[PDB]
Amino acid sequence: EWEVAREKITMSRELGQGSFGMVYEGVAKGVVKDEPETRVAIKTVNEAASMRERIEFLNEASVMKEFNCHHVVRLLGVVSQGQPTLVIMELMTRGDLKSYLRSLRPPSLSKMIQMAGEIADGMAYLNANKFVHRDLAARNCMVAEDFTVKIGDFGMTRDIYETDYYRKGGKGLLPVRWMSPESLKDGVFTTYSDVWSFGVVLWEIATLAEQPYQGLSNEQVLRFVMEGGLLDKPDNCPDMLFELMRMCWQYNPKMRPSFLEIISSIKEEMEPGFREVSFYYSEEN
Ligand SMILES: COc1cc(Nc2nccc(Nc3cnc4ccccc4c3)n2)ccc1N1CCOCC1
Known part of the structure; x- marks a missing residue:
């Protein structure tokens, strides 16, 4: 239920390369309370990645599903469908x-x-x-x-x-x-x-x-x-x-x-x- 439709996520420019793949700067449409669009940071996984890296990625994000503090970068959503897999978070x-x-x-x-x-x-x-x-x-x-x-x-x-x-x-x-x-x-x-x-x-x-x-x-x-x-x-x-x-x-x-x-x-x-x-x-x- 942290699942988001790719439709709702844009991606607008690369920020840099992350442990699990390129991380982008983008926008989301249904990720905050009373907020149409929201600037977000998108984290993808390299296409070369092993089926074990796609399970480390998806698990590092499952870790933040238990956090909720204004002082720890927030996890806004995951796109666990289709590819490239996407982890969405507060920009x-x-x-x-x-x-x-x-x-x-x-x-x-x-x-x-x-x-x-x-x-x-x-x-x-x-x-x-x-x-x-x-x-x-x-x-x-x-x-x-x-x-x-x-x-x-x-x-x-x-x-x-x-x-x-x-x-x-x-x-x-x-x-x-x-x-x-x-x-x-x-x-x-x-x-x-x-x-x-x-x-x-x-x-x-x-x-x-x-x-x-x-x-x-x-x-x-x-x-x-x-x-x-x-x-x-x-x-x-x-x-x-x-x-x-x-x-x-x-x-x-x-x-x-x-x-x-x-x-x-x-x-x-x-x-x-x-x-x-x-x-x-x-x-x-
Ligand atoms: C630290 O880097 C930045 C962070 C954010 N904001 C942000 N918010 C929320 C999550 C997030 N996640 C990650 C995670 N791993 C990365 C690994 C490599 C590069 C980016 C990454 C971003 N990032 C925006 C701009 C920059 N930068 C700093 C340096 O290059 C110029 C752009």
Whole structure:
């Protein structure tokens, strides 16, 4: 019942290539409440794909059928009939948060706190649903037309950010520069490690997306972040942000704040709209 007739979907220009195939920018006609057409992002599957990739695709989308938070890119619909298979989702005109930020290269705080607070509301919602994003960083956060930041389209894939990952012991691609020291060590991902990445996302927002630990190598990151090293407070960083940052980089994961606690601490520095849309104020919470 998330099924949509191809008739209702247009497609208007390629955005780029996604893990499972080309992802387009388009329009849908029967996908929102009281809204004729709606700008949407269309995700197709390569024609070469194995019958197993068409079942990974269709399953990654079956995952979001359980989500519904204003701060996590939404799944508007699937076209599971005919071909090319289509997954339809809320369009984020401004794109990924890392690019956006790299764009602004010469934010207030009202603006930096609004980003942080939406991302955190997204996470709080996810963790609340027993979900643990395991690759939370600017690049996997998208920015909407109205500048809202959302935890969108899970992971995405490859792209211009290959340097963002490394294969600790040649065992596959991991975002080490965003990973908690306990993860680096043991390799396990938790909501606490999610909070660790959150503070790196915050650090990204203050440095307009610089590369975490730039003067270091990936092999050097691992040593440094595992031994109790942290990032420096950036040039003109608001004493508040950085304070929130190292609340997140507490070595012991249990001494770290939760995402809800993080919102609660900035609950009143955020635009008036938050309260009526967020998860934090939702009865769900
Ligand atoms: C991050 O990229 C963008 C996202 C959106 N919005 C959006 N909303 C909702 C879902 C979504 N899904 C995906 C998923 N995987 C992709 C993999 C590769 C490329 C696009 C992808 C889009 N995307 C709009 C423009 C851009 N861009 C950024 C860079 O090139 C210029 C265009």
